[PDB]
Amino acid sequence: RPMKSMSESKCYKNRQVFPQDTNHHHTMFGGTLMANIAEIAAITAMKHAGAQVVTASTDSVDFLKPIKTGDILQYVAMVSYAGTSSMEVVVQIRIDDVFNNKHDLAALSYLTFVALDDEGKPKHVPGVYPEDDVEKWFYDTAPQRVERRKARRIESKQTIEYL
Amino acid sequence: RPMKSMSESKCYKNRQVFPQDTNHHHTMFGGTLMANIAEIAAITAMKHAGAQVVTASTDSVDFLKPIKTGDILQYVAMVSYAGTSSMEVVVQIRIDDVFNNKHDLAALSYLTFVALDDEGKPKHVPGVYPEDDVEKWFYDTAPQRVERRKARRIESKQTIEYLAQA
Amino acid sequence: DRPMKSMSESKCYKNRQVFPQDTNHHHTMFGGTLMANIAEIAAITAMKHAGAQVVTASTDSVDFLKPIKTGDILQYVAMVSYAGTSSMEVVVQIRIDDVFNNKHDLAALSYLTFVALDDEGKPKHVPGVYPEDDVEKWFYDTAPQRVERRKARRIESKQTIEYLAQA
Amino acid sequence: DRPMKSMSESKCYKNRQVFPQDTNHHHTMFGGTLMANIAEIAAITAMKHAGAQVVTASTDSVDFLKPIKTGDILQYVAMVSYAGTSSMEVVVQIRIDDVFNNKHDLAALSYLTFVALDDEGKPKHVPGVYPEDDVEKWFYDTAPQRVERRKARRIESKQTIEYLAQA
Amino acid sequence: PMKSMSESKCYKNRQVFPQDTNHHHTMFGGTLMANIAEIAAITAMKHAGAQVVTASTDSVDFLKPIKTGDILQYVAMVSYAGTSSMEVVVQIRIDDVFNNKHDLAALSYLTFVALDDEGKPKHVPGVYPEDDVEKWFYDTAPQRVERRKARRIESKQTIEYLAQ
Amino acid sequence: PMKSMSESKCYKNRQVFPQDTNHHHTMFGGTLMANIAEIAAITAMKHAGAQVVTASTDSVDFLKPIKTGDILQYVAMVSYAGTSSMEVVVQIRIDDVFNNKHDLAALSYLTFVALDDEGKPKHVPGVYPEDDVEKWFYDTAPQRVERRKARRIESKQTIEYLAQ
């Protein structure tokens, strides 16, 4: 019922790609990218929920452009869907070319968080609303992802129990 | 048409959960788990392809049970589906209780890799087959995941194109 | 400095949670980790502003004002507060972000100086800088005294170097 | 006698690729990084065998047999090759794995000693160990001489400590 | 109670590995400053004989670029001792082992406060120089201390202004 | 041509932080071994006046467990100089600043080979002790070196057995 804009809890992270973050080929390790994604996303989720949160799942990570040593990265995270106690966080990862001022989308990720109280049970969260067109796009496309995620949870119980 | 068992390229990783891998709650940071997952899965994909690989996508990571400091983790990675040039890798993450000989499934992840030749174009990979019941389960359930992953890639393209315009 | 940029144009952010690895024995953030992050974010702001590769000439100061504990959420904000011919003062604010009551407290404050370099590695001219809001105004207005101070300190350092060189 | 465990039962694996951060300037793996990974995998194997918390008593040796380059894929295999009353010798084999030609070469070899501890921090009896194949048999058969040298080295180490306490 | 600058003098020899560098094959500054902070904290603990906290980094001057595979020697000592506070100076040298050379690659000044168990400021011993370089750092300390006190005052003004 | 054990002696003071510890608040053995390798490699380079490679870790003895917040002092020196090879001994002490005490927490012996530009074995200067402790490591070194060479034979047998 109480609502927050997607911008209210929007978090940023600017990082330079150092040799330690890459492979022998000068390409950023996917694991490192995902670690950063998880960090920034968790912070956005805490901001939105105004509470501690736990990562329920990584719903996807798409690697669109290779990231090279010395690149400057901008991570942008915001909530695109608010369930009863849960939040979908969308993270955009862009390559920032400072010499000719271009921004290129290098990766895209969706994660799901659950808000938890002192006691550790699911806490209700505020809803969310977009204010500009990009925000509007992620918001409008949230339902498809939520449906698909539910089906995939079904399949996961089948698999876990088989094991 | 050349084939490999899921066992042939199966890779293991045993790690203990140390304070540096944890958050304020003593729980393992999700990012660290995902980094290790990516690492072990890439190696499995290389073994199978007998070639260099690139991560196309993380199809999912399900966090099923929380992991505490001092837990012993076993990551198992194997190929569950082999397309023409692509591989689905499944990673099981288990908590190994050595005091009570149990393994409990703590996380489950699916990633997609593309094999590349020296020039960097997509390379054909061998097909894959299961030998035991668990391998059989992951192998049999792979097609559903592949169909859904294709639909999701279509929508992802829609989103990318939209951000390109806007 | 005739071409100009606002302090906002090159403003960089960094949101990070304080994990055990970032701490020391006392649950406090190690100063070194803080300074490493500060260096990274400031270097990026300087690159954005200069539109060129940069080198860190000096860390002019880091003031630790409020202790930072594990589980705190930090927000690093970096921006250019002064632009010489080829050099830039970057100011970094480090705030403790309380998400439970939506407050911010300034935990640390840092000033660094960068030089822009062209492909030869020679000093490159940079755009000047101007403030748009009151905080930006504060740092911009107080920058000249810090710059004067940095220029004196450059001399003192060259000397410590020669004195140690002879002996 | 006592309960026994096969060398295979507590066998632990670790597959890791050699990335720039794990390297020295030469593009060769840093010895320290290798020893860290070795110690890590070895402790887990020892824990599995003892079914208890363990402490590292000593690294008995690390032999660097083949240089390791960036992009090499390593397989660490760890197993208990000797079990004393409360102690375990763990042997770690480090192999370079070549996917292109499907061959394995022994790049390093290490022997460590662990002591099992119960909740009190007292030495706990551990199960004995037995081999099932030729490789396991080899490390098992060659264990006594190594255990002997570790013991002598414990003696002289005592000598060194006592000498240094005096001076 | 007094101590010489040498009594608490600490050393640290470290090699510059790829993980410590930037894209330029040059040492990442942040890493340098982390090492500086660490060794300085140790020297401060030895002088104070107590727990310390970093009050400020007063300066870090990057004088020569540092490369991968270079060997660094960090030297830290107390150059000024106030009532409860200590200035630590850190010299960072590139140690050329092929022909016994030392080149000063970086120079840093940090200020620490000693804290007793209550977490309150603890009195520390004063300090005295014994050789020419120790004397140099000692004698030139007052300018740095005055600078530090003024800068703390201005930091308080900034905190006040940012609060509103 | 000769060098004293002190000439190439290297120091390292480091504090034990949570990230360097296992679950019991105790320092991870692996981290210790990494630091030992680093400092020993530097000492070997100074003595040899050349690039070096680690041939073997001859031993690491953990004598005292190391806890969070402890200050460690690593001391490395050459205790033996062969034709092209060097034994380096590393002492790891716990530095108590409250009681001006040093307790030996760990002890390690390593072997290095000096390499020329192309990576062929290079002759190194010999080594000599000047005080009693240096003399002790020097005098006890030959027995350890014989042990190392023998262990190379045993390793040779093991590698060849694995080849079949």
Superfamily of segment(s) A1-163: Hotdog Thioesterase (3.10.129.10)
**What phi and psi values does residue B57 have, to the nearest 5 degrees?**
-160, 155
Closest-CA residue of chain A to B35 = A31
Q: Give the burial class of B159: count Cβ atoms within 10 A of its Cβ; 0-12 exposed, 13-18 middle, 19 or more buried.
A: middle
Tell which A residues from 46 to 105 touch C, by Cβ distance under 8 Å: 46-47, 50-51, 72, 96, 98-99, 101
- Cβ–Cβ under 8 Å, residues A71 and A95: yes
Q: Which residues of F touch C20 (CB under 8 A)?
A: 18-19
**D65 SS3 class:** coil
CA–CA separation, F47 and E97 (whole Å):
8
CA–CA separation, A63 and A54 (whole Å):
24
D65 is in an annotated binding site: yes
Distance of CA B107 to the CA centre of its chain: 11
User: Which residue out of B16, B17, B20 would a mutagenesis test of the F interface target, given it has the greatest number of F Cβ atoms within 10 Å?
Assistant: B20
Of the candidates C58, C160, C163, which has its C-beta nearest E60's C-beta? C58
Strands F2-4 vs F126-128: parallel, antiparallel or unpaired: parallel
Q: Which residues of B38-73 are buried (b: 16+ CB within 10 A; e: fewer)?
A: bbbbbbbbbbbbbbbbbbbbbbbbbbbeebebebbb
> Residue C111 corresponds to which tokens in the numbers above?
């000033």
Among A29, A69, A38, A20, CA closest to B54: A29
Report yes or no: A136 at the B interface, CB cutoff 8 Å.
Answer: no
Strands A127-129 vs A3-5: parallel, antiparallel or unpaired: parallel
Q: How many CB atoms lie within 10 A of CB A73?
A: 21
CA–CA separation, E33 and C59 (whole Å):
9
**What phi and psi values does residue C105 have, to the nearest 5 degrees?**
-120, 135
Task: State in Å, rounded, how far the first CA of chain C is from the last one.
Answer: 42
Our separate counts of H helices and E strands in chain E read 3, 7
Contact at CB, F161 and D138, closer than 8 angstroms: yes
C132: distance to nearest CA of chain B, Å?
A: 27
Alpha helix stretches (DSSP H) within chain D: 31-50, 134-166
Superfamily of segment(s) D1-167: Hotdog Thioesterase (3.10.129.10)
CA–CA separation, D13 and D120 (whole Å):
30
CA–CA separation, F11 and F22 (whole Å):
25
Length of chain A: 163
Report in angstroms the alpha-carbon separations of B18 from B21, B28, B97, F25. 5, 9, 16, 10
Report in angstroms the alpha-carbon separations of D127 from B138, D91, D112, F55, F150. 36, 17, 17, 34, 31
User: Between chain C and chain F, are at least 3 CB pairs below 8 A?
Assistant: yes
Strands B72-82 vs B86-97: parallel, antiparallel or unpaired: antiparallel
A59: distance to nearest CA of chain B, Å?
A: 5
CA–CA separation, C51 and C42 (whole Å):
14
Report in angstroms the alpha-carbon separations of B33 from B15, B61, C129. 11, 10, 43
Which residue carries 């007793």 as its tokens?
E116
Q: Give the burial class of F122: count Cβ atoms within 10 A of its Cβ; 0-12 exposed, 13-18 middle, 19 or more buried.
A: middle
Tell which E residues from 12 to 41 touch D, by Cβ distance under 8 Å: 15-19
- Cβ–Cβ under 8 Å, residues E126 and E83: no
Among B61, B50, B46, CA closest to B113: B46
> Residue A2 corresponds to which tokens in the numbers above?
């109480």
> Residue A163 corresponds to which tokens in the numbers above?
């094991």
Among F51, A22, C117, CA closest to E65: C117
Rg (CA), chain B: 17
Give the containing element (helix H, strand E) for F76. strand F71-81
C66: distance to nearest CA of chain B, Å?
A: 19
Superfamily of segment(s) F1-164: Hotdog Thioesterase (3.10.129.10)
Contact at CB, B38 and A31, closer than 8 angstroms: yes
Secondary structure letter of residue B29 according to DSSP: P
Report in angstroms the alpha-carbon separations of B6 from B44, B81, B100. 10, 9, 29
- Cβ–Cβ under 8 Å, residues E77 and F48: no
Q: Which residues of C touch F69 (CB under 8 A)?
A: 24-25
**What phi and psi values does residue E21 have, to the nearest 5 degrees?**
-100, 165
Chains that touch F (3 or more CB pairs under 8 A): B, C, D, E
- State the method: X-ray
CA–CA separation, F76 and F40 (whole Å):
6
Secondary structure letter of residue E117 according to DSSP: T
Alpha helix stretches (DSSP H) within B50-131: none
- Cβ–Cβ under 8 Å, residues D39 and F33: yes
CA–CA separation, D105 and D97 (whole Å):
7
Query: CB-based contacts of E21: which residues, under 8 Å, 6+ apart?
Result: A18, A19, E27, E28, E68
CA–CA separation, D56 and D58 (whole Å):
6
Q: Tell me, what amino acid is at C95?
A: R
C143: distance to nearest CA of chain E, Å?
A: 12
Report in angstroms the alpha-carbon separations of C129 from B127, C88, C125, F69. 60, 9, 13, 45
Query: CB-based contacts of A85: which residues, under 8 Å, 6+ apart?
Result: A114, A115, A122, A123, A124, A125
Report yes or no: D121 at the E interface, CB cutoff 8 Å.
Answer: no
Report yes or no: E43 at the C interface, CB cutoff 8 Å.
Answer: no
Query: CB-based contacts of B147: which residues, under 8 Å, 6+ apart?
Result: none
CA–CA separation, F2 and B116 (whole Å):
55
Strands D12-17 vs F51-62: parallel, antiparallel or unpaired: unpaired
Report in angstroms the alpha-carbon separations of F100 from D124, E48, E50, E77, E130. 36, 12, 12, 17, 21
Beta strands in chain E (DSSP E): 2-4, 10-15, 51-62, 71-81, 85-96, 101-115, 126-128
- Cβ–Cβ under 8 Å, residues D113 and D107: no
Query: CB-based contacts of D47: which residues, under 8 Å, 6+ apart?
Result: B72, B98, D53, D54
**D159 SS3 class:** helix
Alpha helix stretches (DSSP H) within chain C: 31-50, 134-166
Q: In the CATH scheme, what is the code of domain B1-166?
A: 3.10.129.10
D162: distance to nearest CA of chain E, Å?
A: 27
Secondary structure letter of residue A157 according to DSSP: H
User: Between chain B and chain E, are at least 3 CB pairs below 8 A?
Assistant: no
